[PDB]
Point group: D2
Chain length 475, copies 4
């Protein structure tokens, strides 16, 4: 198992305090892993600065070929990557093999293409006697910080467009899930010039804090809590760094009377509880038309109680556990304070779902109003709340009444209603009659307190490039 | 008389708080006293923007396009009046304003009326089997928008046109020293937009400005001004995760090689180092001159600069105006004096205040500045240019890049190869070759590093004020 | 004065050949006789374009943009004179011209004024080490543009705005029947544009049109018209490898599923099958109605259509006008009578000529037609709609796609699934869902298969008229 | 032992018509006899393409992107074999094919894998109130693709990668003299794509190509070849309104100013005027030299060119191969003979046949040619370059533009002003500055005027093979 930080032209154990990397399924320690010291952080950033000189001067083709080689290397080792991810996060092995790995390999391959495919206003004489052109150039050194929920995929989303933009990068995985990052580092070191990608480990309050405050770092990219993003903006303020923030979401699900309830329920069953609902796009805030409200709750309760987790065979598991005991207790806290109300009812689950490990029972919270904590605030667990609306209510207006703005869905067979909702929802993504589906050509990213910047799509690469106007006077 | 009232939703009204003394900077004489917006007026402006957002975020590009064309028409119809007003408030030579500034302002509103109808995105299709995707660019919300004093009306064009054009609503604050043209445009705009789409409030950065950028309902803050002001805006944005658009000033390097057209270089810096009394984030101010031509350039530029006309009775004969305030003049005076204390630095011309009253400073050439001098490292924002010698053993691009600024730059040489190598490698939002300072409404202006991010002019300005949305329809 | 002169470079000039008898198609009365261009005048026209191209191709996007706005302005100031003249020439009901056509025409010129400033391409950069590449879109050359009679002033807008906008010069020929608005506009254009950028000649397709499209100096031919004419343009392009832009014919299919809003469908078809007396290549003319609603759709459409007002003295009360000519009316009649003699076919309303004078035909509904019937295979170009039944077993999208035409199409269903599958699979340049006929100057219009290729409206029309150029500078 | 079978849907078949004698152009010796497709195999290939279209047109961009990556990978795994076979068929020196062609071919396929996932269009949104528009780029149909003999495998990549990538199916015919690499590629492609997506037939232009281009189910024709062939393709297209994509050859002018690096110019022409024995449409063949450096250029070029190595027994030491055929060689020789007859022209070196066996021609410099000479007006497609003198009185760009061709061009000067002025006024799809011939897969290659239209390489190649579609949903 790879345990070495990638610092410039060499691999190197951390010299600071160890993180106790836990198996979330059993609670047992996977490994103790020392974090980067400040000296190592500086070294990594210095290497990045050194590599920038030559790496910012590569052609799109050269960088494309490098992204394709990272993709091969991952593919060639998809199995071990999948198993290591499964171990680190308690995800079901086939979900990782079948959903995550091909998505991850496709991401690197998608970026290899977008790198050769940036557009801009056409070159020409916009002032008489002067020829203008627009380039999209590297920005500088990127500090990249990843959450624990989709470690290897988060790494693809952060690194592919950063490197592909001609930038050099110092990358930090979550303290809980550094594993796939250290293995991918060993692989990248054999493909990329030294210092183009640097990988350090450690806590957000020490190592992450040092990276986001480092004077040489030009852009900070982060996915995590709203609170973490606010820290990033605060640090950014000190030296006017560019930022890229993906800050979570409570995705609204609007269900009209003419929805296919079977599709809706099966949709929420998987997409509302996938990855134990530790997903920023998780279907969790349900608005249900009054006519189908009771049927929805009923049918959803029984379909949710069949969700398999913690089974002795990782083939039959549909959802995994929560990342930590801390994460589980927080999910349990939001559920208790919901079960607090004499108008809210927990129809299924609500309790913790194991002795050893950090499992939580799939939960349906019903009767919840716009006022309630479970609706207004993010739960980040295998929990879903349901809220009634009527034909006299503007469910889009209700959905839009939020600090969040990442992802959303609308379920109805009526093209008129679905398209009206689609044009009015204040969310980075709106699915119609599905939820949760991503494709690497299409942008994922919040508005409002969910943040700004996109993962996947040409747009991410645009996020990591500087737009430059060149004007030549020739009269 | 003059336009005095704030535009607050459907209401025109006077400020409630402390009066600012708006000064004629040529004379130091008072123009008018104008009261700041109260906290209640700020909140009311924002609430009006919130209400107007409902309908305005729902208009089509053609409708918005048509509004931008109308605003442009209104300004064009009153072009001489805007120009005189702006000349008065800033001390800009009347003809520079009439010929350079108004036509660029009008054309800006017209450019953006086009841009609104011409946003591109990845094409719609089935990227996943049985699912149709499309990409939209939607409004972001309410924009808090704050302008500097150096180009008040133009900066209002740059801040409002793309913001409104993206289907947003705006609360706009001009600099405390330069509200006059903003309150005039506000009158015309109220006759064109539905109420609350544009709201204009006056006041100091530390009072009115601070309250606006910290308003919970404002989702985007756009600021042109000081690096320190952008740092304050970012700190405010940290509280509710607002989007930000920051143009924070520059220190444009001008790389002059031995094979430049020296006459061109000199007439270049004479104009673009000193235009608007150097109160321009793209001023040609940090010169790197190759050893073979350093002394001739210093000698010729000094000669050229000392002929710059200012503070003449006949305003059509003036080339540059004064600095905006006593504070600004002193700051420039203090930078120059600290530079002259340096034994290796020679002030070859100017270097002192330039008038008995009002806020003129003499056009100044600072020779012999090095890469670690304050005058090379920090923005001065006065009619001041420094020159730094490099040799053929020195990488002048590397020197130019060794800066905290990233806004604008130029390279002078007849050699196409050196010119394209430098254009290729310069870490600046903009790089001119054998000119400086020329802008065009289709082309983006905006910085990197501590100059900030976001663009003004071009379709990129409009992209900054819209939200990219992915719509995916599962059909089977 | 009613404008009658050809614009040839810097001269206005009467044609010197055979006169066309321009008719009032409401009454069949003569309006004026208009001489067509000689070969000499066509040569001078193309020569003037050649000469004007030198300078025009070197203008900036902003200069061309401003010229387009000035053209829009001129049309807007004379909107009513234009509408009155288009009504007189074409029989189009006056308020339809005033409220529908003119605003769209004016907005087309303005849309292109923006589009000229907003062309994109792949970004400049170093795609090979030490080489900077950039992409420009430059003028093509001299364009010969040929227009049909159905929408005379709008076709001129679609043909000229992007051609001129892209830096090209033009020789435009209106259809022989409808030259009047083109000649009025040529007079206004001459006061705005440099001589010879736009030239306007009159005459018949087989004399003047044939001469224009065969001219060796003409680099691109644009035609909107019959499939046979597009073929003739293609034959002519073959002699000198001219670029071509061909909009050639539409027989718009309308797929109505059993779950459509039937009231909306009926009201849609009442408006869109008959607008401009069905002289529209996007007319909703070939209807496919599912077994469940077929009968009711036929009854309700029959009834709705029988109320369409035309040929009333008060022109403000007319909903549709006459056909352009006696020939065109006689052509429509033949198609319909031949259809009626078919055993499985029923004419449920209309089917006769509709006036004692002029060239009206009764709005007609034709039920029980099949894929094999002439009325369904061939474009009729008159106020005639046909309804064909299909069952849940049939693939109506395949039926629709079983055509040589590929211009426009609509699908009517409240089911989002059915609507999206159809949208993705229809082999048509345009697909509406739950409407038909609605255009917008930002979105492209043009065919696939034998409907041709090239777009009108949108940035794509401007792209058709510019040449993509790769410029690569070796710098090491 | 080589691949000899046509690919016709799910089957490999020997052609059944007359055999082509495929020759080694270095020796004149026979390589293999290879039968043409019959009319029935042609119809079969097209019908297989029609059937495969139903499924292939409905694949996602990712699916197609992966198909292109596997084709790229397969060629890469057999790079040396492909190289050897192309070197045998064309007599191209082995390391030119290995180091220049193969990497360009393989990268072309990877480039398009990327472009497929990266198409853009006007953004989706409500251009009319209550109507969501979006733009798609969908497949056009069945492509008939015809390739020339000069770059067989590369032309195949240029034709197939974007056509397949746009979701079309294809029937491809290589040049009758160069089928060998296409048949080898056919086996690899057939292990990767669904049957009938790509079909490969062989034969003469007059028989098989003619039958292919005139097939009524072919919706688009792409030809790279001679102007005459392009006119024939247009002739065919007139009969069913087929889309066309035409690269019809070049006569690349090279403008050399008095202040160019003459060493570079000489070295540029030595390589880029004679690469592939000048059987290349971008060959640096028409030189315009300033009066001050004309005599120097001619002298030094002559020197440089008489050292060009060819027909050595060690192929790694050969820099150019032979002409493809005797008819080609005799055409080149006949062009030179006629130039030599002109009294003001001097063949300074070469000008004769260059081998006893096979089809070598001597690298040739033709000095003193004017604008009026045949050798300047007409493409020669051999190892021949002509030089014309211009003075400072003359506008050399205008001279370059006085041409029926418009494919590629270069300008040589140290002066950035002169380079950029030229680059903006040259009427050529490509202009290089201070190099020639350099291509890159992201950048388009295609001509104007009689060089045709459409692009090879770049996203524009893909746009040429897709149909732009507007979908509009009335939601209210
Ligand atoms: N995982 C997500 O994307 C996501 C989305 C929405 C909400 N959340 C919320 O966040 C909490 C934990 O999730 P998480 O750990 O993935 O998010 P987090 O923000 O706590 O951690 C994300 C990354 O940022 C780093 N980090 C943390 N504090 C930092 C600081 N001050 N400076 C620099 N870097 C710092 C972490 O080490 C980690 O690499 C949960 O309570 C959950 O509700 C997470
Ligand atoms: N208007 C359309 O878009 C359209 C589409 C399909 C069919 N049609 C049919 O065409 C008839 C009406 O004619 P139209 O004017 O609409 O189209 P048309 O093809 O007859 O003419 C269009 C334009 O092309 C010109 N033209 C005609 N013959 C030419 C030639 N040989 N060379 C060069 N130019 C030539 C005409 O003068 C006119 O300006 C109707 O019967 C209608 O059914 C029209
Ligand atoms: N190779 C080029 O790109 C090019 C460019 C300009 C000129 N030329 C000239 O063309 C001659 C060499 O032939 P080439 O293969 O390069 O060009 P070509 O036009 O003769 O052949 C190109 C392709 O077109 C096919 N073809 C030929 N006649 C056809 C017809 N009537 N219908 C349909 N398809 C047909 C051919 O079989 C071949 O596959 C030389 O004399 C050269 O001067 C070639």
């Amino acid at each position: 198992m790879d345990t070495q930080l990638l610092i410039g032209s060499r691999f190197e154990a951390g010299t600071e305090a160890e993180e106790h990397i836990l198996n979330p399924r059993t609670g047992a320690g996977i490994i103790d892993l020392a974090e980067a010291s400040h000296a190592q952080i500086d070294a990594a950033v210095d290497a990045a600065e050194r590599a920038f000189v030559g790496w910012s001067q590569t052609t799109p083709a050269e960088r494309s070929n490098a992204l394709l080689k990272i993709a091969d290397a991952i593919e060639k080792e998809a199995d071990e990557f999948a198993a290591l991810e499964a171990l680190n996060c308690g995800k079901p092995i086939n979900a990782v093999k079948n959903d995550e790995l091909p998505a991850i390999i496709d991401c690197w391959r998608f970026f290899a293409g977008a790198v050769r495919n940036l557009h801009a206003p056409a070159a020409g004489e916009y002032l008489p006697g002067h020829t203008s052109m627009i380039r999209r150039d590297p920005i500088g050194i990127v500090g990249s910080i990843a959450p624990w929920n989709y470690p290897l995929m988060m790494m693809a989303w952060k690194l592919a467009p950063a490197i592909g933009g001609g930038n050099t990068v110092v990358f930090k995985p979550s303290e809980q899930t550094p594993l796939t990052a250290l293995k991918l580092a060993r692989l990248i070191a054999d493909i990329l010039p030294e210092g183009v990608v640097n990988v350090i480990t450690g806590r957000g309050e020490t190592v992450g804090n040092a990276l986001i405050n480092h004077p040489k770092v030009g852009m900070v990219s982060i996915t995590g809590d709203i609170a973490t993003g606010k820290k990033v903006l605060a640090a950014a303020a000190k030296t006017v760094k560019r930022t890229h923030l993906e800050l979570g979401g409570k995705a609204p699900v609007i269900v009209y009377g003419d929805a296919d309830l079977e599709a809706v329920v099966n949709g929420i069953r998987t997409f509302g509880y996938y990855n134990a609902g530790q997903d920023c796009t998780a279907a969790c805030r349900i608005y249900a038309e009054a006519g189908i409200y009771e049927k929805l709750v009923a049918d959803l309760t029984s379909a949710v109680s069949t969700i398999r987790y913690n089974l002795d065979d990782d083939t039959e598991n549909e959802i995994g556990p929560l990342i930590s005991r801390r994460q589980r207790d927080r999910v349990a806290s939001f559920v208790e304070r919901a079960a607090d109300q004499k108008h809210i009812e927990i129809t299924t689950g609500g309790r913790t779902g194991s002795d050893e490990g950090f499992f939580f029972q799939p939960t349906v919270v019903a009767g919840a109003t716009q006022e309630d904590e479970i609706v207004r605030r993010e739960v980040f667990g295998p929990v879903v709340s349901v809220t009634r609306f009527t034909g006299k209510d503007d469910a889009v207006a209700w959905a839009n009444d939020s600090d969040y703005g990442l992802a959303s869905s609308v379920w109805t067979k009526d093209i008129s209603k679905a398209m009206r909702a689609a044009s009015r929802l204040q969310y980075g993504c709106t699915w119609i009659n599905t939820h949760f589906m991503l494709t690497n050509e299409m942008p994922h990213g919040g508005i409002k307190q969910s943040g700004y910047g996109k993962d996947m799509s040409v747009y991410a690469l645009e996020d990591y490039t500087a737009v430059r106007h060149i004007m030549i006077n020739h009269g």
